[PDB]
């Protein structure tokens, strides 16, 4: 099943500066929605699959 595994890619931390708040929304955007949402669910199918 390791053939069918998408790794943990690190995304471009594109910083936005809301006044004095510097933080990259792209990074946690990818982290949540793919690196943790898509990733966990997919590996859950692989877990039930094996």
């Amino acid at each position: 099943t390791s053939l069918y595994y998408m790794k943990h890619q690190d995304f471009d931390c594109g910083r936005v500066k809301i006044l004095f708040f510097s933080f990259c929304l792209g990074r946690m955007m990818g982290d949540l929605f793919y690196n943790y949402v898509f990733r966990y669910v997919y590996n859950f199918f692989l877990a039930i699959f094996g």
């Binding site: 931390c13 004095f20 708040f21 510097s22 933080f23």
Partner: protein, 43 residues
């Protein structure tokens, strides 16, 4: 004599109101610097 006496007393009253102006603008400055905290974020 008494006239320029109230002038002394009287721009002394302007004294106190200028001191109040000090107080107001200083507090406005502390308010904006509070809104201007230095962040320790490095990531």
């Amino acid at each position: 004599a008494i006239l320029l006496a109230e002038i002394n007393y009287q721009m002394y009253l302007d004294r106190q109101i200028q001191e109040r102006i000090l107080l107001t603008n200083s507090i406005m400055l502390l308010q904006n610097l509070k809104a201007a905290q230095p962040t320790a974020d490095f990531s």
